[PDB]
Curated annotation (Swiss-Prot), chain A:
Name of this protein: Spike protein S1
Function: Attaches the virion to the cell membrane by interacting with host receptor, initiating the infection. The major receptor is host ACE2. When S2/S2' has been cleaved, binding to the receptor triggers direct fusion at the cell membrane. When S2/S2' has not been cleaved, binding to the receptor results in internalization of the virus by endocytosis using host TFRC and GRM2 and leading to fusion of the virion membrane with the host endosomal membrane. Alternatively, may use NRP1/NRP2 and integrin as entry receptors.
Organism name: Severe acute respiratory syndrome coronavirus 2
Effect ascribed to mutating residue 26 to D: In strain: Alpha/B.1.1.7
Part of the whole protein covered: 545 to 593 of 1273
Record note on quaternary structure: Binds to host ACE2. RBD also interacts with the N-linked glycan on 'Asn-90' of ACE2. Cleavage of S generates a polybasic C-terminal sequence on S1 that binds to host Neuropilin-1 (NRP1) and Neuropilin-2 (NRP2) receptors. Interacts with host integrin alpha-5/beta-1 (ITGA5:ITGB1) and with ACE2 in complex with integrin alpha-5/beta-1 (ITGA5:ITGB1). May interact via cytoplasmic c-terminus with M protein. May interact (via N-terminus) with host bilirubin and biliverdin, thereby preventing antibody binding to the SARS-CoV-2 spike NTD via an allosteric mechanism.
Amino acid sequence: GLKGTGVLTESNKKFLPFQQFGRDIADTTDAVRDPQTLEILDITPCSFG
Amino acid sequence: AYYVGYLQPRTFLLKYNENGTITDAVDCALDPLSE
């Protein structure tokens, strides 16, 4: 249900075993857990300028 | 010995570390230094 647009790179984030989302400075989701493999995936929005 | 506290609606500033662990907190309605 979390909708977004970006590149799904490897996060290198140490989530606690209950945690599902990662936030850094705002309401953006910086890192997200894979629902199937439980791999922690980064959310970086696509390149812009 | 067992301890019973009670919960209040209260604002905190939580110190997350680099590992995602909450290491410290400020009770924002404790004393005016905390405000």
